[PDB]
Design a protein around this motif. Structure first.
Motif, mmCIF file in Angstrom:
data_model
loop_
_atom_site.group_PDB
_atom_site.id
_atom_site.type_symbol
_atom_site.label_atom_id
_atom_site.label_comp_id
_atom_site.label_asym_id
_atom_site.label_seq_id
_atom_site.Cartn_x
_atom_site.Cartn_y
_atom_site.Cartn_z
ATOM 1 N N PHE A 254 -7.833 3.152 -26.989
ATOM 2 C CA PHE A 254 -6.557 2.486 -27.237
ATOM 3 C C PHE A 254 -5.515 2.873 -26.197
ATOM 4 N N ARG A 255 -5.404 4.168 -25.887
ATOM 5 C CA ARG A 255 -4.356 4.561 -24.944
ATOM 6 C C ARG A 255 -4.645 4.057 -23.531
ATOM 7 N N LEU A 256 -5.929 3.980 -23.134
ATOM 8 C CA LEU A 256 -6.253 3.427 -21.819
ATOM 9 C C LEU A 256 -6.001 1.929 -21.775
ATOM 10 N N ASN A 257 -6.232 1.225 -22.883
ATOM 11 C CA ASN A 257 -5.868 -0.182 -22.888
ATOM 12 C C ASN A 257 -4.374 -0.366 -22.731
ATOM 13 N N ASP B 145 -6.593 5.884 -9.782
ATOM 14 C CA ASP B 145 -6.681 6.603 -11.050
ATOM 15 C C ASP B 145 -6.876 8.078 -10.728
ATOM 16 N N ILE B 146 -5.894 8.899 -11.080
ATOM 17 C CA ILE B 146 -5.978 10.335 -10.862
ATOM 18 C C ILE B 146 -6.565 10.989 -12.101
ATOM 19 N N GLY B 147 -7.631 11.764 -11.916
ATOM 20 C CA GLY B 147 -8.343 12.320 -13.057
ATOM 21 C C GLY B 147 -9.207 11.297 -13.766
ATOM 22 N N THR B 148 -9.951 10.503 -13.005
ATOM 23 C CA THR B 148 -10.566 9.289 -13.520
ATOM 24 C C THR B 148 -11.752 9.566 -14.432
ATOM 25 N N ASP B 149 -12.289 10.782 -14.410
ATOM 26 C CA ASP B 149 -13.433 11.151 -15.234
ATOM 27 C C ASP B 149 -14.614 10.223 -14.968
ATOM 28 N N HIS B 150 -14.849 9.232 -15.833
ATOM 29 C CA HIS B 150 -15.987 8.332 -15.675
ATOM 30 C C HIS B 150 -15.587 6.951 -15.165
ATOM 31 N N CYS C 238 -10.326 8.878 -8.563
ATOM 32 C CA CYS C 238 -10.125 10.214 -8.014
ATOM 33 C C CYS C 238 -10.293 11.283 -9.079
ATOM 34 N N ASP C 239 -10.864 12.408 -8.675
ATOM 35 C CA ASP C 239 -10.972 13.559 -9.544
ATOM 36 C C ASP C 239 -10.975 14.830 -8.703
ATOM 37 N N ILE C 240 -10.459 15.899 -9.297
ATOM 38 C CA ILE C 240 -10.511 17.199 -8.652
ATOM 39 C C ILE C 240 -11.900 17.822 -8.759
ATOM 40 N N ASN C 241 -12.730 17.344 -9.683
ATOM 41 C CA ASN C 241 -14.048 17.908 -9.964
ATOM 42 C C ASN C 241 -15.122 16.909 -9.542
ATOM 43 N N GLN C 242 -16.076 17.367 -8.725
ATOM 44 C CA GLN C 242 -17.138 16.479 -8.261
ATOM 45 C C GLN C 242 -18.075 16.074 -9.393
ATOM 46 N N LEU D 45 -12.771 12.669 -4.134
ATOM 47 C CA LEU D 45 -12.627 14.030 -4.632
ATOM 48 C C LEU D 45 -11.333 14.625 -4.079
ATOM 49 N N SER D 46 -10.400 14.989 -4.962
ATOM 50 C CA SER D 46 -9.074 15.379 -4.498
ATOM 51 C C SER D 46 -8.291 16.036 -5.623
ATOM 52 N N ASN D 47 -7.474 17.016 -5.256
ATOM 53 C CA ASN D 47 -6.465 17.558 -6.166
ATOM 54 C C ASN D 47 -5.272 16.602 -6.191
ATOM 55 N N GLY D 48 -5.187 15.789 -7.246
ATOM 56 C CA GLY D 48 -4.027 14.929 -7.422
ATOM 57 C C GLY D 48 -3.872 13.945 -6.267
ATOM 58 N N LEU D 49 -2.738 14.012 -5.580
ATOM 59 C CA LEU D 49 -2.380 13.001 -4.597
ATOM 60 C C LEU D 49 -2.606 13.455 -3.164
ATOM 61 N N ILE E 128 -2.197 8.194 -14.123
ATOM 62 C CA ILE E 128 -2.558 9.559 -14.457
ATOM 63 C C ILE E 128 -2.611 9.607 -15.969
ATOM 64 N N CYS E 129 -3.813 9.756 -16.527
ATOM 65 C CA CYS E 129 -3.999 9.707 -17.969
ATOM 66 C C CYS E 129 -4.791 10.915 -18.445
ATOM 67 N N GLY E 130 -4.375 11.464 -19.582
ATOM 68 C CA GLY E 130 -5.124 12.540 -20.197
ATOM 69 C C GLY E 130 -4.896 13.911 -19.604
ATOM 70 N N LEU E 131 -3.719 14.162 -19.035
ATOM 71 C CA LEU E 131 -3.310 15.490 -18.608
ATOM 72 C C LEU E 131 -1.982 15.830 -19.268
ATOM 73 N N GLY E 132 -1.624 17.121 -19.209
ATOM 74 C CA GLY E 132 -0.323 17.558 -19.668
ATOM 75 C C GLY E 132 0.783 17.325 -18.638
ATOM 76 N N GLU F 115 3.319 18.704 -11.365
ATOM 77 C CA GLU F 115 2.850 19.358 -10.146
ATOM 78 C C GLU F 115 2.142 18.372 -9.218
ATOM 79 N N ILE F 116 1.300 17.499 -9.774
ATOM 80 C CA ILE F 116 0.700 16.435 -8.972
ATOM 81 C C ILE F 116 1.778 15.585 -8.305
ATOM 82 N N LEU F 117 2.886 15.330 -9.011
ATOM 83 C CA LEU F 117 3.922 14.479 -8.439
ATOM 84 C C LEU F 117 4.642 15.115 -7.250
#
Ligand SMILES: Nc1ncnc2c1ncn2[C@@H]1O[C@H](CSCC[C@H](N)C(=O)O)[C@@H](O)[C@H]1O
Length: 226
Positions: free
Chosen positions: A5-8, A22-27, A46-50, A73-77, A93-97, A103-105
């Motif tokens: 729902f929140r991604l929609n 998409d920063i932190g795109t996961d899948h 994009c994701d910080i984790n491979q 593969l990247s830390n944020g921007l 940027i979805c699903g982070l605090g 800090e990404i900004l």
């Protein structure tokens, strides 16, 4: 549907775009959805984790979108500096605090025109950021999903910040939350939790004063949007 729902809610705000990131795109289900529905022509996933980025690439392959979605593969921007990254209509940027997001900004770049952020903590520091840079907060809303709350905020860098009152900076432009029973309910529950703490700590602790003031700020803001 492939989106929660929140991604929609993020996807409804995106149309007629050339490139999004998409920063932190996961899948990469959000980039995939956006490309499949012709909301964007290309996407940077994009994701910080491979590790999840490997799943993202396979997903992009199974839908036949490798020519439209690109894993980064990247830390944020940090990647946006690069010469092959095009101008970006929307960074999501979805699903982070909020702390992580702010800090990404720090690496905001002139290639980027708009942010859609879906934070899982309240975003007073993100609104201060928008205001202090004179960016428009185009849209906000408040979302409950899977026993968790989420703060959605859209920032349009090409329009001026509205002249937000200090209560609005704290809790959200009235415009977006007038008569919002979900958010008011959440804020009354915040007052209850703070009251419990006031009945436990010493009234000479500076936190008591601060907590007493938080409660009154909330009650004022509740009264305005009620
Ligand atoms: N600083 C950072 N830069 C880029 N990605 C980050 C990051 N910190 C965490 N992440 C990634 O962000 C993801 C958060 S899970 C969020 C998944 C999806 N975007 C959603 O909203 O549902 C994780 O995959 C994590 O690897």
């Amino acid at each position: 549907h492939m989106l929660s729902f929140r991604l929609n809610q993020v996807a409804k705000l995106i149309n007629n775009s050339t490139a999004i990131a998409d920063i932190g795109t996961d899948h990469a289900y959000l980039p995939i959805y956006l490309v499949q529905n012709n909301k964007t022509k290309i996407a940077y996933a994009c994701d910080i984790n491979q590790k999840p980025l490997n799943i993202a690439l396979k997903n992009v392959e199974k839908f036949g979108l490798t020519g439209q979605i690109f894993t980064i593969l990247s830390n944020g921007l940090e990647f946006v500096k690069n010469k092959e990254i095009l101008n970006i209509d929307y960074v999501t940027i979805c699903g982070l605090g909020s702390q992580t997001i702010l800090e990404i900004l720090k690496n905001d770049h002139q290639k980027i025109s708009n942010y859609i952020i879906c934070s899982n903590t309240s975003v007073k520091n993100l609104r201060l950021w928008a205001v202090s840079h004179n960016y428009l907060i185009k849209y906000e809303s408040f979302i409950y999903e899977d026993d968790h709350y989420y703060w959605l905020i859209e920032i349009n860098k090409n329009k001026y910040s509205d002249h937000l009152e200090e209560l609005e900076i704290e809790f959200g432009s009235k415009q977006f939350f007038n008569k919002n029973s979900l958010y008011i309910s959440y804020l009354e529950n915040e007052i209850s939790n703070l009251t419990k703490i006031l009945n436990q700590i010493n009234p000479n602790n500076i936190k008591y004063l601060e907590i007493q003031n938080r409660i009154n700020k909330i009650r004022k803001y509740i009264d305005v949007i009620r």
